[PDB]
Structures are given as C-alpha cells and as structure tokens.
User: Fold this.
Amino acid sequence: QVQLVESGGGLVQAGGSLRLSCAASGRTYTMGWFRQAPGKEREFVAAMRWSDTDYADSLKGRFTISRDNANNAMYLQMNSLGPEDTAVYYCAAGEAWLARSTHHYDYWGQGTQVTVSSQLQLVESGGGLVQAGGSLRLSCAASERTFSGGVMGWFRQRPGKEREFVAAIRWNGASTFYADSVKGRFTCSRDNAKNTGYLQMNSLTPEDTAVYYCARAVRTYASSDYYFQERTYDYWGQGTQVTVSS
Amino acid sequence: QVQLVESGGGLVQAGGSLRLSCAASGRTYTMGWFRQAPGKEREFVAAMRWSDTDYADSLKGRFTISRDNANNAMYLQMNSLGPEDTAVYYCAAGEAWLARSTHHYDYWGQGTQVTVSSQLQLVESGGGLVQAGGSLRLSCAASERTFSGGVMGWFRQRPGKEREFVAAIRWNGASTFYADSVKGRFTCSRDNAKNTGYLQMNSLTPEDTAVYYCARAVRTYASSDYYFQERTYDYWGQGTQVTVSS
Amino acid sequence: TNLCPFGEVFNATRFASVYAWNRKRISNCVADYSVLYNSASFSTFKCYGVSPTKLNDLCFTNVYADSFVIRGDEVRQIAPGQTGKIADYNYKLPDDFTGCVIAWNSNNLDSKVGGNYNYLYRLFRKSNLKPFERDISTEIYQAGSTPCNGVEGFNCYFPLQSYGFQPTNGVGYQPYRVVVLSFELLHAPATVCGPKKNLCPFGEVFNATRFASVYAWNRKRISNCVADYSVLYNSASFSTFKCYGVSPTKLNDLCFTNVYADSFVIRGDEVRQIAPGQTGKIADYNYKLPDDFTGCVIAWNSNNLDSKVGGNYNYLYRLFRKSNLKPFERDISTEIYQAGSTPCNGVEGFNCYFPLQSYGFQPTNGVGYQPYRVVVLSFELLHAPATVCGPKK
Ligand SMILES: *[C@@H]1O[C@H](CO)[C@@H](O[C@@H]2O[C@H](CO)[C@@H](O)[C@H](O)[C@H]2NC(C)=O)[C@H](O)[C@H]1NC(C)=O
Ligand SMILES: *[C@@H]1O[C@H](CO)[C@@H](O)[C@H](O)[C@H]1NC(C)=O
Assistant:
C-alpha cells in the first residue's frame, strides 16, 4: 500500500509560476498528475515512467514533470499560469504506462488547491426533454457491491407498449451489446469507482421517446441472448422519462 | 503431433446420404469438419468438444456429428444432400472451443471428394471499373515471408495528385487503422496462411477513382503515425486501377 | 560423454525477441562452465546465490536457460530487484533469484546497414510482469477511458516496438545476446512437516467464509509450520482425499518443501477432473494438474453453505478459450472470445461471446450438479535427485 502526499499549492498571480511536489511511501512505478475544477470531472495533466514523460496536449510547453529519485518524490513545474489552471491538483501512482485516465492508477494523494487571479438499489438520472437530433446521457448509480457478475441492462417502455431491450454492459468486464434499433446511436459504459452505469444516447428521434429503466442481472451467461429478456433481471431502477420533439 | 485419416466419400445422387470418419492417432481435444468447393474458400460444417456440438446454422438438421468411444473416431452423417454440397470435406483438430474458422485448428486431414448429381515481391489484384455505390475487394500477396513484423498499408494516386495513405493492418497483429477519407467504408484484413492482405472498399464514389498500391513497412512502431508516410515503406506492389463511374 | 547442450542455446543462429523470450530446459547432463567462460568473449558473466568459480563443483535440481536480445544499456535490468522497460514489461527475475546471467555483444550477428527491426520489445502494458512471466499478447493498448474497438489512433496503440540495430551505433544502443541460467540448489531446507523435524493455518484455508471461483483459483503458500495431516483427515466429512506421488497414510512421517494450497469451487461430477492426466471443461480451461504431480486433492459437498433459493450464480467457470491451460496456469481475462474470422471490436453478438459463465446452484439440484469446495495441496519432495552437474561433481 503506497501513500502519496502533495504540497506546494497556493495563490498565484497571472503569468506566474508554481511548483507542486508529491512525496511517496515507496515503490512508485508510474506517477502522474490530474486536476479537478469545482463540480467538474478529473483531467489528466501529465505523467512519467522510466524517464519518459507524457503531457496533455494543451499544456505541454508550460508544465514540466520531474523526479528526485533519492527523495522518492516527484515535482510539477507549472509556468505562465492563467485562470483556466484553477483547480485541485491530485498526484497519482500505478503500474500502467500511457496512463491518461483515472482507471489506470491505483493510489491517490489528498489534493493541493491552486488558484490563479488575473438489498440492491438502482437510482436513475439524466432524462428529460430534447430536440430531435440531440443527445442525452443517462446515469444509473448502484449502492452496493454484493454481486459483481452478469450485466447492467437498459430497457425502454414506449407509449402504449411492452418494455423492450435497448443496451447492456458487462459488470464482470468491458464488453457491450445493443438492440438493432439503437446500434451505432447508443453507447453504454460504466465507472467502477462510482459504481455507476451510463448510457450515451445520440441522434435522438421521436421514436426513442419512452420511459428508460436500468437493471442488474446477477447471473453470468456466455452468450448475450438471455439478457434481451426482462425475466433475467433481478433488480430495477425507478425509471426516467426521455422525450424527443417532433 | 496428431494424424487425421479420413474414411468415406464418393458420388451420390440428390436426396442421398453419406457418412465420413476421422481416425486420430493421438489424443484430440476439439474436432471438426470443413468443406471446400472448386476455387472457393473453406466453409465450416460442424465441430465437437466434450460431447457439446456446434453446427453451421446453414447445414444443421441435415448434418450431424458423433463419436465412437471404442474407436475414438468421429463420424459426420450427411443427409438430404443437394448439388450445393459438392466439395472436398476435411477433418480438423485443435485446442480452441467455439472454433468456426480455419485458424482455430492446428492439424488437418487429407480430404475426401463428395459429388452430388442434380527481394520481397508483392502482387496486387482485384481492381476494376465499378458503379457508384458499389464495392471492390483488392488483395495483395507476398512471396518471401521473411519479415513477419511491421505493417501492410495501402496508398492511392488520384489523377493530378500525390500518393496518399488509405489504410493499414498490423502484420504481427489484427489491429488496423485508416485515413479519414475512407473511415466507415474501407476495411483492412489479412490471411496468415496465404500471406495475403485484403482491402474491402465499400460505398465507392467517383472521388475514390485512383491507382491503388499495397506496400510493406518492416519496422514495428507502436505509434502508427509513421505508417501514414510513404517514406516508411520498404516494398511496393505494381499498382492497380480502380475507376468508379458517376 | 553426456555434455549439456549449450551449443544449441548459446550458438543458435536465431535469437528470440525479449518480449517472447525463449526458454530451454537443461537436465540429465554434465556442464563444464569454464569451457563456457572461454567459449566466447562475454561482456557480462555474473551469478546470484552461488559462486562462479565454484560452479564446476556443484549440482542442481532444475536448470532453465532463457534466451533473448536487448540493448546494451538494458543488460543492467536482467538482475533481481531492477526496473525499466525490460524488467517491468518484458522479462522479470524474482528477488530470490539463484542462477547466472551471461551476455555478449551481438553487433556483428544482429545488425544490418539499413537497420535490423526484427527484434522487438513490449513498450506499454496494464501492469508489471510477475517473475518469469511471458506476455506474447498483440492487443491494442488503451491509454484512455474509451475502448479501442480494434482500431488504432489516439489513445489506442500497438504495444510492441522494434529495436533499430545499426552498425554505426553507440555501444549502449547495440544488440546484446543474453542467456539466463536459473538453478535450484540441491540441498533444500524443509518448510512443512508432521511430528518429525507453530501449527499450519489449515483452518483458515479449509473453513474460509468465502471460497473463490474455479477460473480465478486462489493459491495460499503454506510454509514454516507443523502440518496436522492426521487431524485434517476426519476433520469434516470429505467425499475425496485422493493423493498422488506419495502414500496417504505417511503424511505425518513425510517432510516437504514449497507447499501450496489451491482452493476453489466446482460441480460434483467435475471433481473427477481435478487429477493428473484428466481432460474436460475444468481441466482444459480452468485448473490443470501436471502429469508428474505430487500432492493431495481434498473435496467436500457444500450444498448447505453455497447454494440458496434463487441460486448462487457467483461461482463462475471459463467455457471458451483459444488453447488449453498449461499446468498450474491461471487465466482471469474477460476479453470477448472470437469464434469466427471477423474481429469482435469490443461488442458481443454472433461469433463474439463472453468467455465466463455462472454455475447455477439452487438446493433442489442433484448430487452431480451440486457445489464441491476443493483444496489441492501441492508438495515438493525433499532430497530430490540432482539433474545437472559439473565435471568435478
Ligand atoms: C559455440 O561455438 C563456438 C565456436 O564454434 C565454440 O567455441 C570454440 O571455438 C573453437 C575454435 O574456433 C572450436 O574448436 C570450437 O567450435 C569451440 N571449442 C572447441 C575447441 O571445441 C563454443 O564451444 C560453442 N559454445 C558452446 C559450448 O555451445
Ligand atoms: C473447521 O471447522 C470445524 C467445525 O467447527 C472445526 O472443528 C475445525 O477445527 C476447523 N478446522 C479444520 C482444519 O478442520
């Protein structure tokens, strides 16, 4: 178990500099930096492994990542700072190279602030009204990690009709599968950390107007055939209304 | 090292039956049947493992596989034969389950005819004239087989223009990449057996009219950026005209 | 004479790419190591856990000779405890490594005027290799959050890359051939015993609240303790206690090294497969015991503890695989199994299947289709014969 401790974050004037520092327990391997604005997701900044670096393309010239091997600590030299750099900066560690996302890292720091002046329950969210051609992202947050098997499926209930299968992603792995009605328009993913499933719904038409439900089936079949049927799923969400204008 | 002696075969009238046999010298794990017409590819018929069976959906009901415990020999019962079934039928053994393709099988039998009365060189081929909306499959065969790494790539030279990259496939993998001009239309493909690469060109427009070249880069890069450039490639094919009528 | 085949290993025309490092076994022969030392002009000839001048006076239980090519400045990484591209993602020696590491400059053999790009190294990987692991995967490396779906581009990279060996190259960027001889020292201290010469955690293993699924079988090392083999027999009502390579009444009397305890759950009629020279769904694709196995297989009916009214679908098994497992291999992958000739591109459908499946365990089920918790005790017999020796013996 590795422990990471950030320091060096404060207030800076525009056009100014800062140097953040991350000290580790030991056995670091890949180490990198993320940043998080208020009410926004994390954002890869830079990382390094065996003296090779990797920066995010927007900020490569300004920022400089480095390691003091004797101290077991790394630094990030941020130059020419602007208002867009204002966030909580996190330091992370893992064993994967070309780690440009949260999932690739195992250990995280506390997070130094920088500021620059110039019984399984499933809960759905993200539905609503949208213009034709528009998009919509559903979330389906689970509250328990009892069952780590099967899939999370999504079902739609069209006005005056029986529930039909839409799309599903495995809870064991990364694989997905989709009904022919949404193939190429809808996409589902999941975040393990937040135990939440998502469904990106693109290129919506009035036909897609329906009540969307998520659901977990605990059982793990090799073929996807059984997951097209609602009998297979044990737990369900309250459902959310998606409406598409004509 | 396993041996596969095939028993059975011959001429039969439509409506007829036939039964074929594999004799396996050694222990086999998964065993199957393939057929091959004159001048066409091998087609999967059926295969068996652990007393589970798998048939081609086309041929099921008419074809049935079994095993004798005494002989340790498998049989392929072949009912209601039509002239569509004239081919050379093949034994095959492997270690892969759900094996429906020639590359999942290591060892092969000799074949039996069934009849039913009613300095790397590169050679490109498959070009032509085609209606708009139409398709074309180029193929590019290599002789030497010295360099088993890098990439096979495709380029095209339009009228009054320079040689542009189109698509490519890893020679030491299955991963494949394309140019934006052909995304969603062209697909790269290869066969290790025949040491040949392919390029399926779909939904063709007059703007696709050009001289299409195949080419090999021997150097294995992780990035793929270098393979978009002409200079990276060591060996070229002669070139083949594709023309798409308005 | 019966000399060891170091000609095959050291003199081969063809040398492996480090990522797909070659292993040759060496046994039943006599190796003159000083003939080796004079046989060529080596750049590196070092040994660990054994003195290189005393090599001719020694005899070993196991020997493996591993062969590959790396850069000059990467030879540093073929020691224990090291890190870097090669140690982390291509070839890793363990911290307790006993053996030798031989290397030599290869530039006359492995360069070419245009460049020799036939020698490869893995550049990206999801995690570090375990000791003596070998990864021959050519799957697309995913640098970001989105899947790659079979197509390269941004955040989606081929994981291998070729060395560029020129003649007019720096010495640290020149090719070097590397042989790694791994020994097991003959006289081996016993770690587990009965009444001869506190207690081993056999309660922890056999009465754990949670048992693992067969595809992801769970190894616990048993060492530096007293094995209560008499009390284990008739602790609970075992359906199976068959033992291989050693008698089932002399377990207390006997003393062994390097003990391991592998625990998992399978169907009843599948218990048959947990034994040497067996085949089937479990033995082929989930847990394979070698033919020359030395140990004990213990299994008991679990229907009161594992099954439940709806069912217990938590216990999975691998159904489809490209090849049979090697003995004592574990595969935890959840990559889509490709049944056809088209690639799957991270989406399931026809010819594109998930490789695992849940064992269904409702209480109504017959004895054949009931849960059986299986512990497989794996021993290494003490005072094993020598296999490779030096001339002086
Ligand atoms: C690898 O082969 C080399 C060269 O063939 C062997 O080195 C010796 O070279 C001398 C003089 O050229 C030859 O007589 C023999 O080929 C080798 N020694 C003798 C005198 O037999 C070397 O022995 C080989 N390494 C091994 C042991 O595989
Ligand atoms: C397992 O459980 C039984 C029953 O409680 C107990 O008597 C025994 O000591 C435990 N340990 C072993 C190794 O059997």
About this structure: The pocket of 2-acetamido-2-deoxy-beta-D-glucopyranose (ligand 2) is lined by residues C 202-203, 206-207, 232, 235 (CB under 6 Å). The radius of gyration of chain C is 25 Å.
